[PDB]
């Protein structure tokens, strides 16, 4: 499976995470010190993807956060952290 | 990365790197107020004239390759 | 090749299944074939395929033409089995081809609107969004005149459905091109001499413009009102109704500004209040209710007093829509500055509570919510008691829905305004009615629990006399055959524990706790979690010595409850154990604490976030209680014993102990375990160091020097994973102690991390790059540029590749900071390289 980050210009949409991957950070897979709120671009939030989990893609339950380490390194200032799989379309799963 | 202007690779020439860092320096001057103040004190010109001269230098800050 | 085809895709892409040659294919027919192929790649395809097909279909849209393009696109958009995301992709490709085909779509506009307009009335919100978007792109492509020509004949249509749809589409094209661009057309159509359907449709256009654009209307509100105002005195009744509703929509959109734009509408509505009846009267009242909150205080008072006669008259109306309209109007009037509280108490409240507050209103849920919210808003201005006393006696009623209604009303009122306005008589009435309403419940309505808790917490110390009366009911409720009622009683205890403690009735709370202690064997997990939360709320407010049962008896009973698989039981049991350990640690032996701690370690790898949070907090509590050494010895033992994810709990617990107790009590023993020659346990020690420093953060500022030798040993060729985890440790250190004067030891560790930059294995070089970026933020980009310049330009190409990767990371990380750190580059014969401005001297 060949996955990547969206990395588009993020908007006013708040990132969201499901029950499986809740306290986890979207970038470095850490559970330590949730710092800055996750923003995503409008395309990743449109339609049936409203409030969808940023990592997997299931019913989100809590806001997504970068960790303190990624905030320090300004890894939140990059693009949209939405995980996209280049080997599927919009109807798969 | 190709998106971030100023990055490089194994085939980045000396001229490219130097003109990149010269443009970065000019933007830093335009941004930091006291840097511009120092530059406008050393040579007697208005802040507006200094900013205009820097924006003019932005073209070929080092010269043609 | 060709992507996958669903069953419904054959109907639209069968011709692509046969492998025929295009040289044989007829022209124009061949271009339609290529359109058919591009749309297949767009609809079903990977993101690269989709983007490439979008670029190919946009850059060649003119050569293809509007005809074949839309004749291929429209049947797909009407497919019954079309996914919503496929519809969105089609919407995007339509927008992108409309931007290129500027005016060529003019002959096809009609054929588009027969397909798109049904989306504007679809239940799916995003379907309406997509329809409005493509109609807007079409209105920007073709001219305004083309849209007006194509949509004008459908204005005076005989059917109301098509009139409504055309009005919505006209509103969409108005928001697309701008209000002034459609102002002359609307001014002409709203005064059409031919029929009344045309003026009704124009007014509907204005109403939908209001609804669609909201606050973006205020610049043209005067123009819209002056265009639409003549419709209130029209001969037709439906056009008067729709003009009133459009005025209401314009008022709602312009809230709270722009009252002066309605100067010509106040007297017409005022006269129509006394003239019209029925649906027209409802529309006039709705417009007045949405217009009032825009007025000044004195004029709001004047207009409200002017309309209140008919407003009260319409209270006893048989129509339900009329009832909802007048209730919304009351809520709007009594929530504005100018309508005084005494006026509402005198003229509005008696008929309000007479006609509205009836039993059958609590049956329908929309009327329920409307009346509840309106009554709460009334209490927000006229006072809490003046509203509660009028329906407090209805808490003792035979119909339970009415009791639930009055309970939720009182709950919201007292949660908004406290209990300062309630006298003693009303307090006794509240207590009696709430006790009767709680005692008699067909089912455990949560609204009753919320109301009880809110009223008790608002009364505070004033509920002291009624406390035995409440505790008796709670005790009788705990002894019930129904489990979901026992858990409701436990939740009530949880919510009222703090007030019971404030009321100085610790004996009653101790009796409650000793009653709960015997219920820990509940077979239903949710009631068990509720009673655990109740016990936690009782313990968290009463001293440990006074508490019954004694903590020494209660905690060993709580120990085996941690083995339950239910999330609620685990969370509440852990929270209670932690509240015990925080202040009652002296009542429990170290052996019991150790057994709890070892039964609590597995809960560190729970899947629910709250369970892990509670486990970490209570582990920190018990570590502060016992002391670091007794638990840390067995922690290191478990670490060397076990492997895999189960060990990560051991690592997290070691970090928790290192944070709670100061890290000097764990780091030496943690580093000792690195001495044994087993390569499997040294890696675990390194992982523990990594997570420990990441967890303590700035606290590790006094411990980089102590660990530096172990790291410089692990940075040597002991194993790949050794150096990987050591680089992870360096990264977490640098990010944690960043900005606390650790440049010496970190700059030293950089000399050991750097030789590992020429490594091919992916994970270890990724860890090395992470350590390098952490060291960049901690040491500064200056030292990083100093280490990078020596290899930035090098005869070897692999050296240049690696060093340029490093430099790119440094540059993206801190470009502005690098200005003061670049070296001197003397200018040669062909270029100027020295920055002369930085050489100025003052």
């Amino acid at each position: 499976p060949d996955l990547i980050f969206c990395r588009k210009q993020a908007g006013v949409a708040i990132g969201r995470l499901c029950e499986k991957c809740d306290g986890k950070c979207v970038i470095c897979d850490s559970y330590v010190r949730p710092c800055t709120l996750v923003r995503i671009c409008d395309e990743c939030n449109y339609g049936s993807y409203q409030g969808r989990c940023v990592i997997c893609g299931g019913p989100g339950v809590s806001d997504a956060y970068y960790c303190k380490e990624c905030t320090i390194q300004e890894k939140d200032r990059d693009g949209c952290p939405k995980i996209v799989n280049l080997g599927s379309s919009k109807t798969d799963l | 990365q190709s998106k971030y202007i100023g990055t490089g690779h194994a085939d980045t020439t000396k001229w490219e790197w130097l003109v990149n860092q010269h443009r970065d320096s000019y933007c830093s001057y335009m941004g930091h107020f006291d840097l511009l103040n120092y530059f406008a004190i050393a040579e007697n010109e208005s802040k507006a004239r200094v900013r205009f001269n820097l924006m003019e230098k932005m073209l070929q800050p080092c010269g043609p390759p | 090749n060709l992507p996958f085809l669903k069953p419904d895709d054959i109907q639209y892409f069968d011709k692509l299944l046969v492998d025929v040659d295009e040289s044989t294919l007829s022209p124009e027919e061949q271009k339609e074939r290529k359109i058919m192929k591009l749309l297949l790649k767009i609809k079903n395809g990977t993101p690269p395929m989709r983007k490439a097909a979008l670029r190919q279909i946009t850059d060649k849209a003119r050569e293809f033409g509007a005809g074949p393009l839309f004749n291929q696109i429209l049947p797909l958009l009407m497919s019954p089995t079309l996914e919503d995301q496929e519809r969105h992709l089609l919407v995007k490709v339509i927008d992108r081809i409309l931007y290129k085909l500027d005016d060529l779509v003019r002959p096809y506009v009609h054929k588009i609107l027969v397909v798109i307009e049904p989306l504007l009335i679809d239940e799916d919100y995003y379907a309406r969004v997509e329809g409005r978007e493509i109609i807007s792109n079409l209105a920007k492509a073709a001219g305004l005149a083309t849209m007006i020509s194509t949509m004008r004949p459908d204005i005076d249509n005989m059917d109301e459905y098509v009139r409504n749809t055309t009005a919505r589409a006209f509103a969409v094209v108005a928001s697309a091109l701008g209000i002034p661009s459609l102002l002359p057309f609307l001014k002409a159509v709203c005064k059409s001499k031919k029929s009344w359907q045309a003026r009704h449709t124009g007014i509907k256009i204005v109403q939908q413009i209001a609804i669609l654009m909201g606050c973006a209307i205020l610049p043209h509100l005067r123009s819209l009102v002056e265009i639409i105002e003549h419709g209130l005195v029209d001969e037709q009744q439906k056009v008067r109704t729709i003009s009133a509703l459009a005025i209401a929509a314009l008022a709602e959109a312009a809230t709270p500004y722009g009252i002066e734009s309605f100067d010509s509408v106040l007297k017409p509505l005022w006269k129509g209040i006394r003239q019209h009846r029925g649906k027209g009267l409802a529309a006039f009242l709705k417009a007045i209710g949405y217009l009032i909150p825009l007025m000044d205080a004195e004029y709001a008072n004047y207009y409200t007093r002017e309309v209140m006669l008919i407003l009260i008259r319409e209270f006893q109306s048989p129509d339900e829509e009329m009832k909802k309209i007048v209730l919304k109007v009351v809520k709007q009037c009594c929530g504005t500055d100018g309508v005084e509280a005494n006026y509402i108490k005198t003229e509005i409240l008696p008929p309000f509570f007479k006609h509205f507050w009836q039993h059958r209103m609590a049956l329908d849920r929309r009327n329920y919510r409307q009346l509840v919210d309106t009554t709460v808003e009334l209490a927000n201005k006229v006072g809490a008691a003046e509203i509660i006393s009028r329906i407090v006696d209805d808490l003792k009623d035979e119909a339970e829905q009415y009791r639930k209604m009055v309970m939720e009303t009182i709950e919201k009122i007292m949660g908004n305004l406290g209990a300062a306005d309630i006298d003693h008589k009303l307090e006794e009435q509240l207590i009696d009615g709430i006790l009767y309403a709680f005692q008699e419940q067909t089912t455990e309505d949560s609204v009753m629990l919320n109301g009880f808790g809110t009223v008790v917490n608002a009364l505070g110390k004033r509920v002291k006399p009624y406390l035995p009366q409440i505790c008796g009911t709670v005790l009788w409720r705990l002894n019930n055959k129904s489990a979901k009622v026992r858990q409701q009683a436990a939740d009530l205890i949880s919510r009222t524990a703090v007030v019971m403690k404030t009321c100085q009735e610790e004996k009653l709370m101790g009796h409650l706790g000793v009653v709960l202690y015997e219920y820990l064997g509940e077979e239903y997990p949710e009631v068990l979690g509720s009673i655990l939360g109740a016990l936690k709320a009782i313990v968290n407010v009463i001293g440990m010595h006074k508490m019954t049962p004694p903590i020494k008896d209660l905690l060993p009973r709580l120990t085996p409850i941690l083995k339950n698989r239910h999330e609620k039981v685990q969370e509440n049991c852990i929270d209670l154990v932690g509240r015990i350990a925080d202040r009652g640690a002296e009542y429990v032996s170290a052996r019991e604490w150790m057994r709890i701690c070892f039964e609590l370690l597995e809960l560190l790898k729970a899947h629910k976030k709250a369970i892990r949070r509670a486990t970490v907090n209570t582990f920190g509590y018990i570590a502060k209680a016992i002391g670091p050494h007794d638990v840390l010895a067995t922690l290191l033992n478990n670490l060397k014993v076990q492997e895999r994810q189960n060990r990560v709990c051991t690592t997290v617990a070691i970090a928790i102990v290192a944070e709670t107790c100061s890290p000097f009590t764990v780091l030496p023993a943690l580093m000792n375990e690195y001495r044994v020659p087993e390569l499997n346990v040294q890696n675990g020690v390194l992982k523990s160091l990594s997570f420990l420093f990441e967890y303590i953060g700035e606290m590790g500022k006094d411990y980089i020097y102590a660990v530096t030798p172990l790291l410089e040993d692990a940075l040597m060729d002991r194993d790949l994973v050794h150096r990987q985890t050591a680089s992870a440790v360096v990264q977490h250190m640098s990010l944690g102690v960043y900005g606390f004067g650790c440049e010496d030891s970190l700059n030293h560790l950089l000399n050991y991390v750097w030789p590992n930059v020429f490594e091919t294995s992916p994970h270890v070089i990724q860890a090395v790059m992470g350590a390098l970026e952490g060291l960049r933020v901690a040491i500064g980009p200056c030292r990083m540029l100093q280490y990078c310049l020596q290899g930035l330009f090098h005869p070897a190409r692999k050296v240049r590749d690696v060093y340029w990767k490093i430099y790119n990371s440094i540059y993206i990380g801190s470009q502005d900071a690098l200005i003061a750190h670049y070296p001197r580059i003397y200018n040669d014969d062909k270029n100027t390289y020295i920055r002369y401005e930085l050489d100025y001297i003052l």
């Binding site: 210009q9 993020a10 908007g11 006013v12 300004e74 200032r77 | 202007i5 100023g6 443009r23 970065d24 933007c27 335009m30 941004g31 107020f33 006291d34 840097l35 103040n37 120092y38 004190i41 050393a42 007697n44 010109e45 208005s46 802040k47 507006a48 004239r49 205009f52 924006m55 003019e56 932005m58 073209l59 010269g63 043609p64 390759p65 | 697309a176 701008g178 973006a216 205020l218 809230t255 500004y257 960043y738 900005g739 004067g741 933020v777 500064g780 200056c782 993206i812 801190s814 502005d816 900071a817 003061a820 750190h821 100027t832 020295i834 002369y836 930085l838 050489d839 100025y840 001297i841 003052l842």
Partner: protein
């Protein structure tokens, strides 16, 4: 001993880089929001007394690069949009009740720092408040849409990309297009052509363009519609009023021209800038506008455009139903060069000068009915000449208030020169004709200013007479003698072309005051320098020496000599024909003067020539130490010239300053850090024995003891570097340890270890090129250090900087913070809400009033 300092700003920055006016209080009163650099300040000029009061001042801990105000449709209060050095844009609303800047919105889009392609440098809002646009100097620009909700609270949307690679943006401004789709006009230039032509032709062939970005609201996207090349390069744009009250379009301000342009069927109307009659400047020098202003009324609208010389011209456009016929300019007045001007309603003009004091004037005559010649674009013009006007003193404006500003501070000495118990701060600052030496006394500071002739570089104190020996030097300036000779040559040229015989006499008789009309400065390598001897008590100059038209003073030192008696001497280093950019100096000269009449007159003993510029002169054990270029020499007084006895050559780049303690000398390099050199008397040689591991653009230095040196960066940093223990100054290859690093956010040109209040704790006071004064106070115990450190930590997260910047990252701008606690942030504990104060104090196991008293206790020990 470990060095842990507490940083406190005694005198906030007083310079101004941006100023906007508007109704920020929600009432009919109009206030002014100014940017002091790293401070955001609010001012209210009282229209009854004509004085400016300060209502609010906030440390934003960032670099404010842009600042504008906007208003929604039907709104009563103006919001405040700020673009910082952060990757964020912030929208603030002033609340007069709480007296604070409430951050209404904060949206992130990029990385922090004054970056090249990260938006923040340029900010342009739509005149109807519907959309704002934040742009960088290169490539990307972002458009946000602003609206309101049902509760009338501002709402911001997702950004809209308007990026274009290889594009340099000179200036962006919104266009008043009424209520159509908003539009933004940019002065852009593409450099992709210039970087691929090794001949340089594409560089001279590429030209500046005026481009227009339209935000389609119905389609919700930014499109780059028009892009017209410009004749000559413009420096900025002016938004002319549009819609129902004015013709939309733009005014491009160029060099010697101003052009109205508008898309559609509109001709380009350009007008040459009226040059000053009998201009004493260089004929090859051009004239540009430095700032602008716009005042709109229900009747008319006009612009105020200030030139390089300080001439404010009133600009009006002739309507001609819908296409402008002509641009009409007329000489309004003359004020000092300003970074921004605000034409307030109720008739007041706020002039925020680029340096020196700021001014507030009242308008009395709009220039309508005056005999002064008004200039237009339809007038016939040969293109070989331009319009001429005569500058006159103030007549349309009246001075009603003057705000004191120490910017720019070039040197400072803290000492008790007057016989008082508390020492005074003698600050040599100002620029050009508006320079001054100011005495500051605290008992916030109270100042008294004595004007100077040129920009002071460095001044020393005479130990015996307490008098100050200042050197003043300015580039491309004329000396007094050369100015008189130029006026004489112009009078000679004037008597041929017979009223000119009287006109030239009147011209020679009229000496325009340069303090109000600017100084006639021209030429490239020209330099005006003056040595002055002044009394600290009075404002009188005790002696003055003018120098050559090409001689520029850069160093000064008064000292006794062991070669002679206790009679003092004054050495002044001077460069000749410097030519700053590119650098190419001719030679240097050291003036040796004898000090007579107990420090009241200078006796020209001799002039000693030397290769390059003497940039540093310091006494050193009977003899003297002088730095020339990268050569550190020791000189001794001779009978006719200065005799060299020893030199050191291995200095890296260029000496910018030297200071000596004992037998060591600390050479400051222009780019590298300090160098510790040892002088052995018997061997009579200078041997470098220590250097540093970090390059530092040194500006000033101050030896704290025998092993530590505290220095300041050109980039706004303060460092403290100490030699390692057991460092014998005989062997080389010794590296010094950086024991303290801090970023002030402002360039420091004077560090000094002293004690302000007598007997108190010894502190380290620094001055600020932006007109500020700060202190670093050492910590006494680890308890206080840990307490204030935890206060800083908690305030970093509970009260973050106002303009999106991160405090720790900001103070770690160029080097990570090392052992400095930010007191400017800690004192913001008093500005928080009671809930956060109580929570943080409970986290520190004490009460909020106890924390406030602990903070106030530090502002007495300094």
């Amino acid at each position: 001993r470990h060095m842990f300092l507490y940083n406190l700003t005694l005198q906030r920055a007083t310079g101004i880089s941006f100023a906007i006016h508007g109704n920020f209080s929600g009432t009919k009163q109009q206030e002014i929001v100014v940017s002091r650099g790293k401070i955001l300040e609010l001012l209210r000029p009282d229209p009854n007394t004509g004085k400016v009061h300060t209502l609010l001042t906030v440390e934003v801990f960032g670099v404010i690069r842009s600042l504008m105000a906007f208003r929604l449709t039907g709104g009563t209060k103006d919001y405040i949009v700020v673009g910082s050095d952060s990757g964020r844009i912030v929208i603030l609303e002033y609340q007069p009740s709480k007296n604070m800047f409430e951050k209404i919105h904060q949206e992130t889009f990029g990385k922090s720092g004054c970056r090249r392609i990260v938006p923040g440098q340029f900010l342009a809002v739509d005149p109807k408040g519907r959309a704002v646009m934040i742009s960088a100097i290169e490539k990307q620009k972002l458009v946000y849409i602003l609206n309101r909700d049902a509760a009338a609270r501002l709402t911001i949307s997702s950004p809209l990309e308007a990026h274009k690679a290889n594009t340099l943006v000179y200036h962006v401004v919104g266009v008043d297009v009424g209520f159509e789709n908003p539009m933004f006009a940019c002065l852009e230039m593409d450099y992709e052509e210039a970087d691929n032509d090794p001949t340089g032709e594409a560089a001279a062939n590429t030209q500046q363009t005026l481009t227009f970005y339209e935000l389609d609201l119905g389609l919700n996207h930014v499109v780059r519609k028009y892009s017209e090349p410009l004749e000559e390069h413009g420096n900025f744009l002016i938004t002319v009023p549009g819609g129902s009250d004015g013709p939309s379009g733009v005014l491009i301000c160029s060099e010697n021209y101003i052009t109205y342009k508008n898309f559609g069927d509109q001709p380009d109307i350009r007008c040459p800038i009226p040059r000053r009659r009998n201009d004493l400047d260089d004929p090859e020098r051009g004239m540009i506008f430095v700032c602008s202003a716009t005042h709109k009324t229900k009747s008319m609208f006009f612009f105020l455009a200030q030139t390089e010389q300080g001439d404010i011209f009133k600009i009006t456009l002739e309507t001609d139903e819908d296409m402008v016929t002509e641009i009409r300019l007329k000489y309004f007045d003359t004020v000092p060069v300003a970074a921004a001007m605000c034409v307030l309603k109720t008739g007041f003009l706020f002039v925020a000068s680029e340096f020196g004091n700021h001014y507030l004037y009242q308008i009395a005559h709009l220039g309508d009915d005056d005999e002064e010649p008004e200039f237009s674009s339809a007038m016939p013009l040969e293109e070989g000449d331009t319009f001429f006007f005569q500058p006159r003193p103030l007549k349309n404006l009246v001075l009603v208030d003057e705000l004191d500003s120490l910017s720019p501070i070039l040197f400072c000495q803290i000492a008790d020169l007057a016989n008082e118990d508390t020492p005074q701060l003698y600050v040599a600052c100002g620029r050009g004709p508006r320079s001054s030496l100011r005495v500051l006394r605290h008992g916030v500071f109270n100042q008294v200013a004595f004007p100077l002739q040129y920009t002071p570089r460095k001044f020393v104190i005479h130990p015996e007479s307490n008098n100050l020996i200042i050197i003043e030097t300015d580039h491309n300036a004329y000396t007094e003698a050369t100015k008189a000779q130029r006026k004489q040559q112009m009078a000679e040229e004037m008597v041929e072309a017979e009223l000119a015989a009287e006109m030239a006499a009147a011209f020679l008789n009229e000496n325009l005051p340069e303090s109000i009309f600017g100084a006639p400065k021209a030429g490239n390598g020209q330099w005006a320098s003056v040595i002055r001897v002044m009394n600290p008590i009075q404002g009188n100059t005790l002696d003055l020496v003018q120098l050559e038209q090409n001689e520029a003073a850069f160093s000064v030192a008064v000292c006794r000599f062991s070669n002679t008696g206790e009679d003092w001497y004054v050495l002044v280093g001077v460069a000749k024909d410097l030519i700053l950019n590119p650098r190419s100096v001719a030679g240097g000269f050291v003036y040796t003067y004898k000090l007579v009449n107990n420090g009241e007159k200078l006796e020209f003993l001799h002039k000693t020539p030397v290769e390059e510029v003497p940039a540093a002169i310091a006494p050193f054990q009977g003899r003297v130490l002088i730095g020339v270029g990268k050569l550190l020499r020791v000189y001794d007084l001779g009978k006719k010239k200065l005799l060299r006895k020893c030199e050191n050559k291995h200095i890296a780049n260029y000496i910018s300053g030297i200071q000596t303690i004992g037998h060591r000398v600390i050479v400051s390099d222009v780019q590298e850090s300090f160098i510790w050199v040892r002088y052995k008397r018997n061997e009579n040689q200078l041997i470098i024995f220590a250097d540093d591991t970090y390059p530092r653009w040194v500006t000033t230095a101050s030896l704290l003891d025998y092993d530590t040196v505290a220095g300041a960066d050109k980039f706004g940093n303060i460092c403290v570097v100490r030699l390692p223990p057991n460092t014998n100054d005989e062997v080389d290859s010794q590296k010094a340890e950086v024991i303290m690093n801090y970023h002030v956010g402002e360039t420091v040109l004077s560090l000094q270890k002293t004690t302000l209040i007598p007997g108190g704790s010894e502190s380290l006071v620094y001055t600020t090129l932006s007109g500020g004064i700060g202190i670093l106070v050492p910590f006494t115990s680890h308890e206080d250090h840990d307490f204030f450190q935890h206060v800083e930590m908690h305030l970093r997260s509970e009260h973050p900087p106002l303009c999106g910047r991160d405090h720790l990252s900001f103070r770690s701008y160029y080097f990570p913070v090392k052992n400095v606690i930010d007191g400017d942030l800690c004192e913001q504990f008093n500005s928080m809400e009671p809930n956060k104060q109580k929570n943080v104090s409970e986290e520190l196991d004490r009460t909020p009033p106890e924390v406030s008293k602990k903070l106030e206790d530090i502002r007495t020990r300094y």
